[PDB]
Amino acid sequence: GKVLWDGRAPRNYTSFHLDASVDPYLTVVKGPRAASIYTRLLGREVTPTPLWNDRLFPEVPYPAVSTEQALLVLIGNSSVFTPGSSGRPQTGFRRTELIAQVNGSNIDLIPIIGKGRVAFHFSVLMDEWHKLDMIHEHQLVFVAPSDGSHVFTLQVGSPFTNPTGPLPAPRADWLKILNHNLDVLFETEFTDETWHNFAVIVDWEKRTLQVWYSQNENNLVWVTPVLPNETVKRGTAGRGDFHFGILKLPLVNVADPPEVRDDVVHYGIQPPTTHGIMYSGVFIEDLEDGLSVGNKFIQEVA
C-alpha cells in the first residue's frame, strides 16, 4: 500500500531530532528528561527487522542494506508523565511513548490514518540489557481515541488485576494483540533475539481488525480472520493517535485505600527500575494493491 506515515527511523536520524520532537515522532509522552534520554537510536549496534531491507547485486559480499535503525525505548523511575502543563502526574504508570505525527502535528494525521482500511506495522525485539518485568502489564503499541481507549493494543506481561492474582500469569511473556474490548485475538511467545513482526489492519468503515505476524525475515502471514471490533465508537470518537513505546501499569498496593486501587494512572506499586524494548519496522500504509508483507512483496487483502 501507500505509506501514510513512516516511523522507520532513518539511518541519519539523531538524538537532536528526538529532542526537537520533529517528524516523524511526537515525543511529549515521557518523564521530564529529554526525549533522547528515554529513546536511543541504535545505529549499526542492532540490526533492525530484515523485512524492509534493500538488497544488493551482487548478493555477496553484502546481500542486504538496512534502510532504518532500530529504536531502544526505555522507562525508569523518572518516567512519570504529566498531562498538559498542569495535570496531576501519572504516578501509577511508567511510560515512554512515541506518537505518529506529520508536519509536527498528530491532529493532522488523524483523518489520514483513520479512513478506509489502514495497516499498522510494528516489529519488536527483546532488550537483553534492561529486561521487562513480566509481573507487570505493558501496553506497547496502540491507537488511542480521545477517551483513552485503545482500538487495538500490543500487550506483554501479566494483565493488571485488582485484587492481585497469581503472578506471573500464564503466558505472561507472550506478546498479545487485543481488540478494543481487551479480547485476546492472537498471542505468541516473546522469544529473545527475534524480530517479532506485526501488522494490524483496521477497517475504519466496518470496524474490523485483522492480525498479521511473522518472525525475522519471514513474510507476514495472517494469524486471525477479519474480526469485528464493534465496541469502538462511531465516527470521529473512534479514531485517534498511534502510540508505540512502553506503558507499564503498576501492581495494586494494598496499603492504598480500596477506593483508589483501580486508579492505575495514579496509584500502585512501581519499582524504581529501568526497562527497555526495541522497535523497528514501525509504519502505517493503506491497502492499495495490497499489504506490504516484507521482502518487497505485496499481498492482496479481502
Ligand SMILES: OC[C@H]1O[C@@H](O[C@H]2[C@H](O)[C@@H](O)[C@@H](O)O[C@@H]2CO)[C@H](O)[C@@H](O)[C@@H]1O
Ligand atoms: O484509566 C485507567 C486506564 O488508563 C489507560 O491509560 C490511558 C489514560 O486513562 C488516559 O487518560 C491517557 O493518559 O492515555 C492512557 C493510555 O492510552 C490504560 O491504557 C488502561 O489500561 C487503564 O485501565
